[model samples]
Target: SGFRKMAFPSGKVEGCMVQVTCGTTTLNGLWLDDVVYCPRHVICTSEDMLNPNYEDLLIRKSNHNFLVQAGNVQLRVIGHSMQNCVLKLKVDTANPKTPKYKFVRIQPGQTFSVLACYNGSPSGVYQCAMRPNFTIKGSFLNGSCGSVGFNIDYDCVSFCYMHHMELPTGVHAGTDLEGNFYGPFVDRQTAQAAGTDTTITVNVLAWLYAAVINGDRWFLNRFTTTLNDFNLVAMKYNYEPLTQDHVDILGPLSAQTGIAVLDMCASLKELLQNGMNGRTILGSALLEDEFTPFDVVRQC
Candidate 1:
């Protein structure tokens, strides 16, 4: 035995000049557009007053207390397959300042009509948010509603009267071409003392290299570059590994070529690891400098 599957085309229901209730009076001539019955399963119907289609229908009701007219509504299907779908409606009472009403949700193969009427003076702008959940599901809105008459304005200004303002992050003094500072490095003593753990240095170098190579233009201004900058940028763009040879040769070469000591060391390490020759360690001694820790000399 074989089971047959049913298919339904997605569609929307729309109408115009809907009557809204206000006390005992019923207001008409309200234009509604893009009124969707189910969004996920199909495209929303258009409410073009001039060129009305199946999606566009006129809402009519006899009761002034009713918000919407149940009968005389039409819909149009955009694509195929509206099977096992549901139609949902949403109202933005926050904007329109209207009372909340239960939205309509219709299941596939379920045919029904809806009548939505409002009370009090119409603000012209009413939230008609709707969602359609079928094979294709999403939100839809009717743009025919009048604009919400409101405006919002805000401004923030800050002034500094001090002679100098320092940032939480270290300020940029003078930057070398690679972007390192000429001034005393931050926490230099702690960094020098931590030199015993090469892992710390390696991790810091990796982060610095990653920032320089993968960073955006603004980051270029924040981080100082040198030999490591060249190696990282080259590796990133050229997909080349920074060999030990490149690191060893590049460090000294970069120092001679105006690259800073720290940057040169990092590049030299990479080159040396890649089997580079004829390279002399220039900054290796600098890594062994004495660091004064809290009035105490720290020895490695």
Candidate 2:
């Protein structure tokens, strides 16, 4: 017999002895369970807070989030692998139709910083990995596309203004820095309860900024009159000129989207407070041309 065999005195079977194989090559190991492996060159991360506000963000953070400024940010990756990783980077943008790439090398215990320039191109996913970046197995490095300056606060405000009837799952409509939801309506309630609303001042300024960007188009079409004059009607703010950026001169170029939404929110609030049923309300310059049933506390 060409096959090898082992005999167990205490065992009996139709098979004479335990033949090594019917017809096979030697598998030097035994049966094993599935596995997930970690490499010596892993990656870790740290993130910085968004520091844009009235003063510093215009020239910077407008392109940044929260509509205050604009700019790029460096992505940081702490190397946790055993060997130096000649990491490759890719920016997966929607407009490009293909991924763009870059490279960075990091020592096992050190860190590397790179740009995830994943902003404004219809969105993109940033990708990174070590050499042999293709998926043929043994590739254990990764990165994502997003600017380092992406702020959580504005995302909340963005959604609240966009939709109002029901909330999307896992989405926080508005969360001020204090971690509480603060919708525009809530702001109104707070202001009404306290007899003052400082937030509305910022709204007037924001629209003023946005109108300046849009060349006062919202303003030019917002009012009705017999002469050349500015009246705070659709948007109740005292600005004779939309180009008057003096009050909103905090940032180099303000975020027009945020300015529009906030000002619209504040303006709608203004109209409701003055004298207009939601049904009678009209105009695009105001935050809501249409509102939910709970938008305002009605009056007979």
Candidate 3:
């Protein structure tokens, strides 16, 4: 019968195979034995790095276990049939804020791919590697991985600062961008002269901008005086401007809130360095008497 002739194979059957094509030439290699353990490295240069296309240098792999060097050329990689294969991409190591390499691991039964470009120009060559057995090797930098991530350099970020406020007491006041005021007065005549009313609004955003960025204390004193005057009128007319108890509570509360906002603005300014624009910070959101948090009112 046919079951009499059984023979064992003579060579290893499980290993990695790599095939890379550059222009019209294709190079093939294998990782069959312990001759080269861990990871193997290869260089695949495109026919023309200046006018390189994704297909200019395409690397195809049967099992993921190697690194590819792109000499002065940007690269796009797609991993297939990989298990615990953690991939890494690195171009610059001098940036302390961002690590030299960014990494991502292939999920079970899924494939991974990445493309690199910087600010509309080709960034540079990339060293793409996969640590054996998905061992941790590189830092994950935000917005540095693919074409999908955005910049962290927030210079001139397009945003709106919408502030909210609630007056401690009800009163009539009119103020302008020039830092001039018409009332807290009981009557509307003075306001009417300015083509305004007892119900007045002001753009203190300029003051706030100066206060947060330049540490201008002028407006805090002015704000204190304005609240005092409004309170005086409320007491005279008996409509209850914030009582001493309420004032005592809200005074420190609002003061701390302002401090928190200033601290947050300063932190954002520092973290987002060039991403922030002072003009945009001063452009809008003239709010009064309501309280809000930094992350909540992000439009400004």
Candidate 4:
């Protein structure tokens, strides 16, 4: 609510939009300018919630199923930060020494269904509660990732963390009572754009090297396919359009981790830009029989 809706033409549903779920917990938009505001009395996961990349989170179960006379109980994971870690469906909550539960790896930004059926303990509590089996090194995750909400055993401690477990941070954040956060945050869209772009630039360039430069012709579509696939997801959800400024920096960073010529992406404005130095060994070898300065279609 800290962001004024007047900025976006969409108004109420503007990228700055906010939503309240289950009478508490505000969900901010994916846009950079969207600020999540809550009550002053709420808990702050880390004192550095002041960081722009600080993402407040919520993890909850969407559903589950178990048969009273069944041999196994199937549990699943859904919603928020599921990608950042994996879960342990503790079959035996009472014992911690043995490999009590089965480990269920979460699909990036997706669901972990009751996919791993836990072996039943016949007359067992079927306490298929899921807890994260991850630890953060430099990640900003913190707060209660919460515990098994949709489980069979009520005796199970609504398992969550007692302190900042991951690299360090929390949810129920963004802002407080007066539309201000006692800690850190950022806008939804702009941050969204920067994050989305920075994360993929490297992997894309790697494909160019690992496949293209390495003479993997079958993977030549790496350029078209990678960008095409990305366009459908990242670009489709972008709060703003991609500008040359983004391309300018993204290419360089990507090239930094690639080949000598890969560095050419930094000044990729002109094919001849790299031509001035002729520093690349692969450049001349890749040239065609009638090689000209530029393609007639100008795709490069």
TM-score of 4: 0.20
- Give the runs in model 1 whose Cα sits over 4 Å from its true position: 1-233, 236-300
lDDT of 3 at 249: 31
Output the better candidate (1/2) by TM-score. Answer: 2
Write model 3 residue lDDT over 114-181, tens digit each, in one string.
12222212222222111111111122232122121111112321110000111223211211111122
Candidate 3 root-mean-square deviation in Å: 26.7
**Pick by TM-score: 1 or 3, better one:** 3
Candidate 4 lDDT, 134-200, residue by residue in tens: 2211112221221111111222211111112222222221221123211232222123111121122
Local distance difference test, each candidate: 0.23, 0.20, 0.23, 0.22
- Lowest-sum lDDT 10-residue window in model 1: 156-165
lDDT of 3: 0.23
What TM-score do all the candidates reach, one by one?
0.13, 0.19, 0.18, 0.20
Clashes of each: 33, 19, 13, 12
lDDT of 1 by residue, 34-133 (tens): 2212211112122232232212221221222224322243222222211122122222211221222222232211111112223211222211111111
Q: Flag the better candidate by lDDT, 2 or 4.
A: 4
Candidate 4: where is the Cα deviation over 4 Å? Answer: 1-90, 93-199, 213-300
Write candidate 2's Cα lDDT for 151-245 as tens digits. 11211111101000112221212121121222322211112111111122233344333334444433322422321222344234322222233
What range of 10 consecutive residues in model 3 has the weakest lDDT sum? Answer: 157-166
> For model 4, where is the 10-residue window of minimal lDDT?
1-10
> What TM-score quantifies how close candidate 2 is to the native fold?
0.19
Model 1, residue 207: C-alpha shift (Å): 3.3
Instruction: Indicate which candidate wins on TM-score.
Output: 4
